[PDB]
Amino acid sequence: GAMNSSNYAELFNNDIKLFVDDTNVYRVTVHKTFEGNVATKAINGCIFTLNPKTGHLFLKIIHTSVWAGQKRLSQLAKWKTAEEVSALVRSLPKEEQPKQIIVTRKAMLDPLEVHMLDFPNIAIRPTELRLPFSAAMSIDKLSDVVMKATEPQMVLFNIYDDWLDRISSYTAFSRLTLLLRALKTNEESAKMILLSDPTITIKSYHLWPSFTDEQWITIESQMRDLILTEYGRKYNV
Amino acid sequence: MNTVPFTSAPIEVTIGIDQYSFNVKENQPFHGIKDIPIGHVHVIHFQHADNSSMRYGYWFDCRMGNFYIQYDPKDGLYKMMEERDGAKFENIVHNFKERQMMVSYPKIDEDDTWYNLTEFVQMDKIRKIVRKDENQFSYVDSSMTTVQENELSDPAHSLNYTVINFKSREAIRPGHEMEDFLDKSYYLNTVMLQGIFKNSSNYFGELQFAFLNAMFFGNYGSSLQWHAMIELICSSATVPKHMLDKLDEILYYQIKTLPEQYSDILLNERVWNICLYSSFQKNSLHNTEKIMENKYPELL
Ligand SMILES: CN(CCC(N)=O)Cc1ccccc1Br
Ligand SMILES: CN(CCC(N)=O)Cc1ccccc1Br
Ligand SMILES: CN(CCC(N)=O)Cc1ccccc1Br
């Protein structure tokens, strides 16, 4: 059934699983037409498919051409997501296929279940967790490869960089979700925290800066403060 | 007109014949039911006064044999049986008719209710759903489960309705996942109609039989089947126009006949609101929508 606070450590056991987030698949800018009506212009999107144990992020870039001549795009986007996830699973060796796929929004359950009828042993599950994966497009290198794509494309990143050499996947996932929650709540502030110190750089294959253990503690503290801050600014508390 | 004579009525019981119900007291001089219209299937059903649990009954067609009911004191129920000796059967039915020991099927010459509820129901198809080939009549009761319910236990005592499952490989063509899930026409027209039922009459027959088992026996699996067969049509964008008009009539008479006080348990709020107000056929069931809105506006 639904993943929640009580069964949280299941994410980090040795049963292969993937999260799938569809919140950046169909993206638009809204603007005024010469006649003063409103129209949308789609921009490139992405499916966010993540193995929380290993950090394996399979980023399927959704090029705007997949929407051409199509109706009801918000509904199509859920089925296109399910189609691409299904294709990904079928492309993996049997022993790499997930035993569970956790969708971050319940409207993905039926589209994915229907696309995965050939895999009766893969469990499709919702979650009661409010995960901040929509903020994936605030990571500069991910946003860059999405917006530069001229055709459909799959790109691979470890979203944990090399952290698992030093911390567990439980801890790496906690760090990731803190970082993403911060970027979602105040992107500018979050990015100033992460990048202000010019002596700490981002390695060319990494997504995040090369913080020492001690620096991560400071950064993690600063991100908590930011989130608490905005919570006050927002609610006047 | 045909007759279902009774050997006796040793235990107090409510007897039902199609949409009608009457009471018989323990050891009352009751010897059965006469003037039963030839040309239709019929159902004779029972609820004991001392254990209203287990409604049970028998689907039969008087053209297929001479049938009578005798209580069995070992198995504790009224059993339908067949007398092959035609001479003997007629000789006995005549004695009962002369002594006026039978109640009369009350068909009133303005009423087409039973025809309209059983138009497509055929005894040959009932006998394939209810497997017990040594008898010409078919036993059904409250507790019998469907082949699909047994998939989600005794196979011999099951209701073999046609399995409908919207999230199944049979319902969904590879490469048309979204199309086939959102518009079930492929599944209705090619898989079910052309492939399994062969024609819409056999489809409507199973739908009607399912409704009646749900209504008369409180058979939950039959209720699920009835609603699934409605939902498959309502969720199809392409349905033969004659099928829609006929479905509207079928459902109208089913809703008209339902006990008002059972509406809470025999009608699925989700299916009906989807069918009348969201589905492709939301504007195609005018008679059904009007009776539903005037009789069960709570549900909607
Ligand atoms: C290193 N390899 C990917 C990088 C690449 N492009 O070949 C491991 C890996 C597998 C699958 C997903 C992410 C990741 Br990270
Ligand atoms: C009791 N009766 C049998 C009489 C006999 N054979 O000696 C059962 C029954 C059979 C046939 C017709 C009506 C009915 Br009621
Ligand atoms: C006669 N009553 C309802 C008939 C009606 N007016 O609808 C119960 C009944 C049904 C069938 C046979 C005998 C008897 Br008694």
Coordinates of C-alpha atoms and ligand atoms in Angstrom, one line a residue:
Chain A
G1 CA 0.0 0.0 0.0
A2 CA 1.0 3.6 0.7
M3 CA 4.5 4.5 1.8
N4 CA 4.5 6.8 4.9
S5 CA 6.4 7.7 8.1
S6 CA 5.9 4.3 9.7
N7 CA 7.6 2.3 6.9
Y8 CA 10.3 4.8 5.9
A9 CA 13.3 2.5 6.3
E10 CA 11.9 0.2 3.6
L11 CA 13.4 2.7 1.1
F12 CA 16.9 1.6 2.1
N13 CA 16.6 -2.2 2.1
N14 CA 18.1 -4.4 -0.6
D15 CA 14.8 -4.7 -2.6
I16 CA 15.3 -2.6 -5.8
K17 CA 12.8 0.2 -6.0
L18 CA 12.3 3.5 -7.8
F19 CA 10.5 6.7 -7.1
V20 CA 8.8 8.3 -10.1
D21 CA 7.9 12.0 -10.0
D22 CA 6.0 13.5 -12.9
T23 CA 5.7 17.1 -11.7
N24 CA 8.2 18.5 -14.3
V25 CA 7.0 16.4 -17.3
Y26 CA 4.6 19.0 -18.8
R27 CA 5.8 22.5 -18.3
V28 CA 4.4 25.7 -19.8
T29 CA 4.8 29.5 -19.8
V30 CA 1.5 31.4 -19.9
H31 CA 1.5 34.6 -21.9
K32 CA -0.9 37.1 -23.6
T33 CA -1.7 36.9 -27.3
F34 CA -1.8 39.9 -29.6
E35 CA -5.6 39.9 -29.3
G36 CA -5.3 39.9 -25.5
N37 CA -6.2 36.3 -24.9
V38 CA -4.0 33.9 -23.0
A39 CA -2.1 31.0 -24.5
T40 CA 0.5 28.5 -23.3
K41 CA 3.9 27.8 -24.7
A42 CA 5.3 24.4 -23.6
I43 CA 9.0 24.1 -22.6
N44 CA 11.1 21.0 -22.2
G45 CA 10.4 18.8 -19.2
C46 CA 11.7 15.7 -17.5
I47 CA 10.7 12.5 -15.7
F48 CA 12.4 12.2 -12.3
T49 CA 13.0 8.4 -11.6
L50 CA 15.2 7.7 -8.7
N51 CA 16.7 4.7 -6.9
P52 CA 16.8 6.0 -3.3
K53 CA 19.3 3.3 -2.1
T54 CA 22.0 3.9 -4.8
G55 CA 21.3 7.5 -5.9
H56 CA 20.7 6.4 -9.5
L57 CA 18.6 9.2 -11.2
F58 CA 17.4 8.1 -14.7
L59 CA 16.4 11.6 -16.1
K60 CA 14.2 11.2 -19.1
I61 CA 14.0 14.5 -20.9
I62 CA 10.6 15.3 -22.4
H63 CA 11.1 17.4 -25.5
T64 CA 8.2 19.8 -26.5
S65 CA 7.7 18.0 -29.8
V66 CA 6.0 15.1 -27.9
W67 CA 3.0 17.5 -27.3
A68 CA 2.6 18.6 -30.9
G69 CA -1.0 18.1 -32.1
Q70 CA -2.0 16.5 -28.9
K71 CA -5.1 17.3 -26.8
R72 CA -5.5 17.3 -23.0
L73 CA -1.8 17.5 -22.3
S74 CA -2.0 17.3 -18.5
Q75 CA -3.7 13.9 -18.8
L76 CA -1.4 12.8 -21.6
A77 CA 1.6 13.7 -19.5
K78 CA 0.7 11.1 -16.9
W79 CA 0.4 8.4 -19.6
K80 CA 3.6 9.5 -21.3
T81 CA 5.4 9.2 -17.9
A82 CA 4.0 5.7 -17.5
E83 CA 5.0 4.8 -21.0
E84 CA 8.6 5.9 -20.5
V85 CA 8.9 4.2 -17.0
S86 CA 7.6 1.0 -18.6
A87 CA 10.2 1.3 -21.4
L88 CA 12.9 1.9 -18.9
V89 CA 12.1 -1.2 -16.9
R90 CA 11.9 -3.4 -20.0
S91 CA 15.3 -2.1 -21.1
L92 CA 16.9 -3.3 -17.8
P93 CA 18.1 -6.9 -17.2
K94 CA 15.7 -8.9 -15.1
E95 CA 17.9 -8.8 -12.0
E96 CA 18.0 -5.0 -12.2
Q97 CA 14.3 -4.4 -12.6
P98 CA 12.6 -2.9 -9.6
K99 CA 10.3 -4.9 -7.3
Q100 CA 8.4 -1.7 -6.4
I101 CA 7.7 1.6 -8.1
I102 CA 6.6 4.4 -5.8
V103 CA 4.7 7.3 -7.5
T104 CA 4.8 10.7 -5.8
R105 CA 1.3 11.7 -7.0
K106 CA -1.7 9.3 -6.8
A107 CA -2.9 10.3 -10.3
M108 CA 0.1 8.3 -11.6
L109 CA -1.2 5.0 -10.1
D110 CA -3.6 3.9 -12.9
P111 CA -1.5 5.0 -15.9
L112 CA 1.6 3.1 -14.5
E113 CA -0.4 0.1 -13.4
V114 CA -1.9 -0.2 -16.9
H115 CA 1.5 0.2 -18.6
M116 CA 3.0 -2.4 -16.3
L117 CA 0.3 -5.2 -16.7
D118 CA 3.1 -7.3 -18.2
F119 CA 5.0 -7.1 -14.8
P120 CA 2.4 -8.4 -12.3
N121 CA 5.1 -8.9 -9.7
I122 CA 6.2 -5.2 -9.7
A123 CA 4.2 -3.4 -7.0
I124 CA 3.0 0.1 -7.9
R125 CA 2.5 2.2 -4.7
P126 CA 1.6 5.7 -3.7
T127 CA 3.2 7.6 -0.8
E128 CA 1.9 9.9 2.0
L129 CA 5.3 11.6 2.1
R130 CA 5.4 15.1 0.6
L131 CA 8.7 14.8 -1.2
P132 CA 10.3 17.9 -2.8
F133 CA 11.3 16.3 -6.1
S134 CA 9.6 19.1 -8.1
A135 CA 12.7 21.2 -7.1
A136 CA 14.9 18.9 -9.3
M137 CA 14.9 21.7 -11.9
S138 CA 16.5 24.0 -9.4
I139 CA 19.7 21.9 -9.7
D140 CA 21.7 23.9 -12.3
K141 CA 23.2 21.0 -14.2
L142 CA 19.8 19.1 -14.5
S143 CA 18.0 22.2 -15.6
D144 CA 20.7 22.9 -18.1
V145 CA 20.6 19.5 -19.9
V146 CA 16.7 19.6 -20.0
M147 CA 16.6 23.1 -21.5
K148 CA 19.3 22.4 -24.1
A149 CA 17.7 19.1 -25.4
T150 CA 16.7 19.2 -29.0
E151 CA 15.2 15.7 -29.0
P152 CA 14.1 13.1 -26.5
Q153 CA 17.0 12.0 -24.4
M154 CA 17.8 9.9 -21.3
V155 CA 20.5 11.3 -19.0
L156 CA 22.1 9.5 -16.0
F157 CA 23.3 11.3 -12.7
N158 CA 24.1 9.9 -9.2
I159 CA 22.0 12.5 -7.3
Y160 CA 24.2 11.8 -4.2
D161 CA 27.5 12.5 -6.0
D162 CA 30.1 10.4 -4.0
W163 CA 28.3 10.8 -0.6
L164 CA 27.7 7.1 -0.2
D165 CA 31.5 6.5 0.2
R166 CA 31.1 8.3 3.5
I167 CA 27.4 8.1 4.6
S168 CA 24.5 5.7 4.5
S169 CA 21.7 5.9 2.0
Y170 CA 19.3 6.8 4.7
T171 CA 21.5 9.8 5.5
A172 CA 22.1 10.6 1.8
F173 CA 18.4 10.7 1.1
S174 CA 17.8 12.9 4.2
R175 CA 20.4 15.3 2.9
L176 CA 18.9 15.3 -0.6
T177 CA 15.4 16.0 0.6
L178 CA 16.6 18.8 2.9
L179 CA 18.5 20.4 0.0
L180 CA 15.5 20.1 -2.3
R181 CA 13.0 21.3 0.3
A182 CA 15.2 24.4 0.8
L183 CA 15.5 25.1 -2.9
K184 CA 11.7 24.7 -3.3
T185 CA 11.0 27.1 -0.4
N186 CA 13.6 29.8 -1.4
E187 CA 15.7 29.0 -4.4
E188 CA 17.8 32.1 -4.3
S189 CA 18.7 31.8 -0.6
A190 CA 19.4 28.1 -0.9
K191 CA 21.7 28.6 -3.9
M192 CA 23.5 31.4 -2.1
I193 CA 24.2 29.0 0.8
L194 CA 25.4 26.3 -1.5
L195 CA 27.7 28.5 -3.7
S196 CA 28.8 31.5 -1.7
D197 CA 32.2 30.0 -0.7
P198 CA 34.2 30.1 -4.0
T199 CA 36.8 27.8 -2.7
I200 CA 34.4 24.8 -2.6
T201 CA 33.7 23.8 -6.1
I202 CA 31.4 21.3 -7.9
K203 CA 33.3 18.6 -9.6
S204 CA 32.6 18.2 -13.3
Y205 CA 30.6 14.9 -12.9
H206 CA 28.9 16.0 -9.7
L207 CA 25.8 18.0 -9.0
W208 CA 26.6 19.5 -5.6
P209 CA 29.8 21.1 -4.1
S210 CA 32.6 19.0 -2.6
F211 CA 31.8 19.8 1.0
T212 CA 33.8 18.2 3.8
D213 CA 31.8 16.3 6.5
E214 CA 32.1 19.4 8.7
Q215 CA 31.0 21.7 6.0
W216 CA 27.9 19.5 5.2
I217 CA 26.9 19.9 8.9
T218 CA 27.1 23.7 8.6
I219 CA 25.3 23.7 5.2
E220 CA 22.7 21.4 6.6
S221 CA 22.2 23.7 9.5
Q222 CA 21.9 26.8 7.2
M223 CA 19.3 24.9 5.1
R224 CA 17.2 24.2 8.2
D225 CA 17.3 27.8 9.3
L226 CA 16.3 29.0 5.8
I227 CA 13.3 26.7 5.9
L228 CA 12.3 27.8 9.4
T229 CA 12.8 31.5 8.3
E230 CA 10.6 31.2 5.2
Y231 CA 8.0 29.5 7.4
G232 CA 7.9 32.6 9.6
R233 CA 8.0 35.1 6.7
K234 CA 5.2 33.1 5.2
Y235 CA 3.0 32.6 8.3
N236 CA 4.2 35.7 10.2
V237 CA 5.5 33.6 13.1
Chain B
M1 CA -50.2 -21.9 -18.2
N2 CA -47.9 -24.1 -16.1
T3 CA -47.8 -25.3 -12.5
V4 CA -45.0 -25.8 -9.9
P5 CA -46.8 -28.1 -7.4
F6 CA -45.4 -28.6 -3.8
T7 CA -45.5 -31.9 -2.0
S8 CA -46.2 -29.9 1.3
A9 CA -45.0 -26.9 3.3
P10 CA -43.6 -28.3 6.5
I11 CA -41.7 -25.2 7.6
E12 CA -42.8 -21.6 7.6
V13 CA -41.3 -19.8 4.7
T14 CA -41.6 -16.7 2.5
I15 CA -42.0 -17.9 -1.1
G16 CA -41.2 -15.7 -4.0
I17 CA -42.1 -16.2 -7.7
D18 CA -40.3 -13.6 -10.0
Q19 CA -41.0 -10.1 -8.6
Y20 CA -43.8 -11.4 -6.2
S21 CA -43.6 -12.6 -2.6
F22 CA -46.1 -14.4 -0.2
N23 CA -46.0 -16.1 3.2
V24 CA -46.7 -19.8 4.0
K25 CA -47.2 -20.9 7.6
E26 CA -45.8 -24.1 9.1
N27 CA -47.9 -27.1 7.9
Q28 CA -50.3 -24.8 6.0
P29 CA -52.3 -26.7 3.2
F30 CA -50.2 -25.2 0.4
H31 CA -49.6 -27.2 -2.7
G32 CA -47.9 -24.8 -5.1
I33 CA -48.2 -22.2 -7.8
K34 CA -50.5 -22.4 -10.9
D35 CA -51.1 -20.2 -14.0
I36 CA -47.3 -19.6 -14.5
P37 CA -46.8 -17.9 -17.9
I38 CA -45.3 -20.0 -20.6
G39 CA -42.6 -18.4 -22.6
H40 CA -40.4 -16.9 -19.9
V41 CA -37.8 -18.2 -17.6
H42 CA -38.9 -18.0 -14.0
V43 CA -37.4 -18.1 -10.5
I44 CA -39.0 -19.6 -7.4
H45 CA -37.2 -18.5 -4.2
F46 CA -37.3 -19.0 -0.5
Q47 CA -36.5 -17.4 2.8
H48 CA -37.2 -19.4 5.9
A49 CA -39.1 -17.7 8.7
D50 CA -36.8 -19.0 11.4
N51 CA -33.4 -18.2 9.7
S52 CA -33.8 -15.3 7.2
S53 CA -30.1 -16.1 6.5
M54 CA -29.7 -17.9 3.1
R55 CA -32.2 -16.8 0.5
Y56 CA -32.1 -19.6 -2.1
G57 CA -34.0 -20.5 -5.2
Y58 CA -34.3 -22.1 -8.6
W59 CA -34.3 -20.8 -12.1
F60 CA -36.5 -22.8 -14.5
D61 CA -38.4 -22.9 -17.7
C62 CA -41.7 -24.9 -17.6
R63 CA -41.2 -25.8 -21.3
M64 CA -38.1 -27.9 -20.3
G65 CA -39.8 -30.4 -18.0
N66 CA -42.4 -31.0 -15.2
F67 CA -41.0 -29.6 -11.9
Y68 CA -42.3 -29.8 -8.3
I69 CA -40.9 -28.7 -4.9
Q70 CA -40.6 -31.1 -1.8
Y71 CA -39.0 -30.1 1.4
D72 CA -36.0 -32.3 2.4
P73 CA -35.9 -32.6 6.2
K74 CA -32.2 -33.8 6.2
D75 CA -30.8 -31.0 4.1
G76 CA -33.3 -28.5 5.5
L77 CA -34.5 -26.9 2.3
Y78 CA -37.2 -26.8 -0.3
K79 CA -35.8 -28.7 -3.3
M80 CA -36.8 -28.5 -6.9
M81 CA -37.2 -31.9 -8.6
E82 CA -38.3 -33.3 -12.0
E83 CA -41.0 -36.0 -12.5
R84 CA -40.4 -37.8 -15.8
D85 CA -43.8 -39.5 -15.5
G86 CA -45.9 -36.9 -17.3
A87 CA -49.2 -38.8 -16.8
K88 CA -48.6 -39.0 -13.0
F89 CA -47.6 -35.3 -12.8
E90 CA -50.8 -34.1 -14.6
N91 CA -53.0 -36.5 -12.6
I92 CA -51.6 -34.9 -9.3
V93 CA -51.7 -31.3 -10.5
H94 CA -55.3 -31.8 -11.5
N95 CA -56.2 -33.1 -7.9
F96 CA -54.6 -29.9 -6.4
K97 CA -56.5 -27.6 -8.9
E98 CA -59.8 -29.3 -8.1
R99 CA -59.1 -28.8 -4.3
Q100 CA -57.9 -25.2 -4.9
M101 CA -54.7 -25.9 -3.0
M102 CA -52.6 -23.6 -5.1
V103 CA -52.0 -19.9 -5.2
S104 CA -52.3 -18.2 -8.6
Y105 CA -49.4 -16.5 -10.4
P106 CA -51.1 -13.0 -10.6
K107 CA -50.1 -11.8 -14.2
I108 CA -52.3 -8.6 -14.8
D109 CA -52.8 -7.8 -18.5
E110 CA -51.3 -4.4 -18.4
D111 CA -48.0 -5.5 -16.9
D112 CA -44.9 -6.3 -18.9
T113 CA -42.5 -6.1 -15.9
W114 CA -41.3 -9.6 -15.9
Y115 CA -40.8 -9.7 -19.7
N116 CA -38.9 -6.5 -19.5
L117 CA -36.6 -7.9 -16.8
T118 CA -35.9 -11.2 -18.5
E119 CA -36.2 -10.3 -22.3
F120 CA -32.7 -11.6 -23.1
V121 CA -32.4 -14.3 -20.3
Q122 CA -32.3 -17.8 -21.7
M123 CA -32.3 -21.0 -19.6
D124 CA -29.5 -22.4 -21.8
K125 CA -27.2 -19.6 -20.8
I126 CA -28.2 -19.7 -17.1
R127 CA -27.1 -23.4 -17.1
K128 CA -23.6 -22.4 -18.3
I129 CA -23.3 -19.8 -15.6
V130 CA -24.6 -22.2 -12.9
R131 CA -22.9 -25.5 -13.6
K132 CA -25.0 -28.5 -12.5
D133 CA -25.8 -30.4 -15.7
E134 CA -27.8 -33.3 -14.4
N135 CA -30.8 -30.9 -13.6
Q136 CA -32.8 -28.8 -16.1
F137 CA -33.2 -26.1 -13.5
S138 CA -30.5 -24.1 -11.7
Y139 CA -30.0 -23.5 -7.9
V140 CA -28.7 -20.1 -6.7
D141 CA -28.3 -18.7 -3.2
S142 CA -27.1 -15.7 -1.2
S143 CA -23.7 -17.0 -0.5
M144 CA -22.5 -18.3 -3.9
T145 CA -19.3 -16.6 -5.1
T146 CA -18.3 -15.8 -8.7
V147 CA -15.4 -17.3 -10.6
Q148 CA -13.8 -13.8 -10.3
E149 CA -14.4 -13.6 -6.6
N150 CA -12.7 -17.0 -6.3
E151 CA -9.7 -15.4 -8.1
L152 CA -9.4 -12.5 -5.7
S153 CA -13.8 -21.2 -3.2
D154 CA -15.6 -24.4 -4.2
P155 CA -15.6 -24.2 -8.1
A156 CA -18.6 -26.5 -8.4
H157 CA -20.9 -24.1 -6.4
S158 CA -19.7 -20.9 -8.2
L159 CA -21.4 -18.4 -10.5
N160 CA -19.4 -18.6 -13.8
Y161 CA -20.1 -15.1 -15.0
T162 CA -17.9 -13.6 -17.7
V163 CA -14.9 -12.0 -16.1
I164 CA -14.6 -8.3 -16.7
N165 CA -11.5 -6.5 -15.5
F166 CA -10.6 -3.0 -16.8
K167 CA -7.0 -3.3 -15.8
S168 CA -6.2 -6.5 -17.5
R169 CA -4.2 -7.5 -20.6
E170 CA -7.5 -8.6 -22.2
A171 CA -8.9 -5.1 -21.7
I172 CA -5.8 -3.3 -22.9
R173 CA -4.0 -3.5 -26.3
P174 CA -0.2 -3.0 -26.2
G175 CA 0.5 0.5 -27.4
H176 CA -3.1 1.8 -26.8
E177 CA -2.8 1.8 -23.0
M178 CA -4.2 5.3 -22.5
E179 CA -6.7 5.0 -25.4
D180 CA -8.1 1.6 -24.3
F181 CA -8.3 2.5 -20.5
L182 CA -10.0 5.9 -21.1
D183 CA -12.3 4.6 -23.9
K184 CA -13.3 0.9 -23.5
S185 CA -14.9 0.4 -26.9
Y186 CA -12.2 -2.1 -28.0
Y187 CA -12.9 -4.2 -24.9
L188 CA -16.7 -4.0 -25.3
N189 CA -17.0 -4.4 -29.1
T190 CA -14.1 -6.6 -30.1
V191 CA -13.2 -8.6 -27.0
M192 CA -16.5 -9.0 -25.3
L193 CA -19.2 -8.6 -28.0
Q194 CA -17.6 -10.1 -31.1
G195 CA -15.3 -12.5 -29.1
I196 CA -17.0 -13.9 -26.0
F197 CA -20.8 -13.1 -26.1
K198 CA -21.1 -13.1 -29.9
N199 CA -24.1 -10.7 -29.9
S200 CA -25.5 -8.0 -27.6
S201 CA -28.5 -10.2 -26.7
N202 CA -26.3 -12.7 -24.8
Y203 CA -24.5 -9.7 -23.1
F204 CA -27.8 -8.2 -22.0
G205 CA -29.0 -11.7 -20.9
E206 CA -26.1 -12.1 -18.5
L207 CA -26.5 -8.5 -17.3
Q208 CA -30.2 -9.1 -16.6
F209 CA -29.5 -12.4 -14.8
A210 CA -26.9 -10.8 -12.7
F211 CA -29.2 -8.0 -11.6
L212 CA -32.0 -10.5 -10.7
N213 CA -29.6 -12.7 -8.6
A214 CA -28.5 -9.6 -6.8
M215 CA -32.0 -8.4 -6.1
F216 CA -33.7 -11.7 -5.2
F217 CA -30.8 -13.3 -3.3
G218 CA -28.7 -10.4 -2.1
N219 CA -25.9 -12.1 -4.1
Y220 CA -22.9 -9.6 -3.8
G221 CA -20.9 -11.1 -6.6
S222 CA -23.9 -10.8 -8.9
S223 CA -24.3 -7.1 -8.0
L224 CA -20.6 -6.6 -8.9
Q225 CA -21.2 -8.3 -12.3
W226 CA -24.3 -6.2 -13.0
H227 CA -22.4 -2.9 -12.4
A228 CA -19.3 -4.0 -14.3
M229 CA -21.4 -4.8 -17.4
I230 CA -23.1 -1.4 -17.2
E231 CA -19.8 0.5 -16.6
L232 CA -18.2 -1.2 -19.6
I233 CA -20.9 0.2 -21.9
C234 CA -21.0 3.6 -20.3
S235 CA -17.2 3.9 -20.5
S236 CA -17.2 3.1 -24.3
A237 CA -17.3 6.0 -26.7
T238 CA -18.5 3.8 -29.6
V239 CA -21.6 1.7 -28.9
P240 CA -24.2 0.6 -31.4
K241 CA -27.1 3.0 -31.1
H242 CA -29.6 0.2 -30.7
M243 CA -27.6 -1.2 -27.8
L244 CA -27.8 2.2 -26.0
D245 CA -31.5 2.5 -26.5
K246 CA -32.0 -1.1 -25.3
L247 CA -29.7 -0.6 -22.2
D248 CA -31.8 2.5 -21.3
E249 CA -34.9 0.3 -21.2
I250 CA -33.3 -2.6 -19.3
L251 CA -32.0 -0.3 -16.6
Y252 CA -35.2 1.7 -16.4
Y253 CA -37.2 -1.5 -15.5
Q254 CA -34.5 -2.7 -13.1
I255 CA -34.5 0.6 -11.2
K256 CA -38.3 0.7 -11.3
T257 CA -38.5 -2.8 -9.7
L258 CA -35.8 -2.4 -7.0
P259 CA -37.2 -2.2 -3.5
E260 CA -36.7 1.4 -2.3
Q261 CA -35.4 0.1 1.0
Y262 CA -32.6 -1.9 -0.7
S263 CA -31.3 0.9 -2.8
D264 CA -28.6 1.6 -0.3
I265 CA -27.0 -1.8 -0.7
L266 CA -27.8 -2.8 -4.3
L267 CA -26.7 0.4 -6.1
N268 CA -23.1 1.5 -6.3
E269 CA -22.9 5.3 -6.0
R270 CA -19.7 5.6 -7.9
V271 CA -20.8 3.6 -11.0
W272 CA -24.1 5.4 -11.4
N273 CA -22.8 8.9 -11.0
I274 CA -20.0 8.1 -13.4
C275 CA -22.4 6.6 -15.9
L276 CA -25.1 9.2 -15.8
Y277 CA -23.0 12.3 -15.4
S278 CA -19.3 11.7 -16.4
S279 CA -19.2 8.9 -19.0
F280 CA -19.3 8.9 -22.8
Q281 CA -23.0 7.9 -22.5
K282 CA -24.0 10.4 -19.9
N283 CA -26.6 11.8 -22.3
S284 CA -27.8 8.5 -23.8
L285 CA -29.8 6.9 -21.0
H286 CA -32.7 9.4 -20.7
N287 CA -35.3 7.0 -19.2
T288 CA -32.8 5.7 -16.7
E289 CA -31.5 9.1 -15.7
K290 CA -35.1 10.4 -15.2
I291 CA -36.2 7.5 -13.0
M292 CA -33.0 7.5 -11.0
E293 CA -33.2 11.2 -10.3
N294 CA -36.8 11.1 -9.2
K295 CA -36.5 7.9 -7.1
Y296 CA -33.0 7.9 -5.7
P297 CA -31.8 11.5 -5.8
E298 CA -29.8 10.9 -2.6
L299 CA -27.5 8.5 -4.4
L300 CA -26.6 11.3 -6.9
Ligands
LIG1 C1 27.8 5.6 -13.9 N1 26.5 5.1 -14.4 C2 25.7 6.2 -15.1 C3 26.5 7.3 -15.8 C4 26.4 7.1 -17.3 N2 25.8 8.0 -18.1 O1 27.0 6.1 -17.8 C5 25.8 4.5 -13.2 C6 24.4 4.9 -13.3 C7 23.5 4.0 -13.8 C8 22.2 4.4 -13.9 C9 21.8 5.6 -13.6 C10 22.6 6.5 -13.0 C11 23.9 6.1 -12.9 BR1 25.0 7.5 -12.1
LIG2 C1 -45.6 -36.5 -3.7 N1 -45.6 -36.5 -5.2 C2 -45.4 -38.0 -5.7 C3 -46.6 -38.9 -5.5 C4 -46.2 -40.4 -5.8 N2 -45.5 -40.7 -6.8 O1 -46.7 -41.3 -5.1 C5 -44.6 -35.5 -5.6 C6 -44.9 -34.8 -6.9 C7 -44.6 -35.5 -8.1 C8 -45.2 -35.3 -9.2 C9 -46.1 -34.3 -9.2 C10 -46.4 -33.5 -8.2 C11 -45.8 -33.7 -7.0 BR1 -46.1 -32.6 -5.6
LIG3 C1 -51.1 -12.1 -4.5 N1 -50.0 -11.4 -3.8 C2 -49.4 -10.3 -4.7 C3 -50.1 -10.2 -6.1 C4 -50.2 -8.8 -6.6 N2 -51.4 -8.2 -6.5 O1 -49.2 -8.2 -7.0 C5 -48.9 -12.4 -3.4 C6 -48.9 -13.6 -4.4 C7 -48.1 -13.6 -5.4 C8 -48.1 -14.7 -6.2 C9 -49.0 -15.7 -6.0 C10 -49.9 -15.7 -5.0 C11 -49.8 -14.6 -4.2 BR1 -50.8 -14.6 -2.5

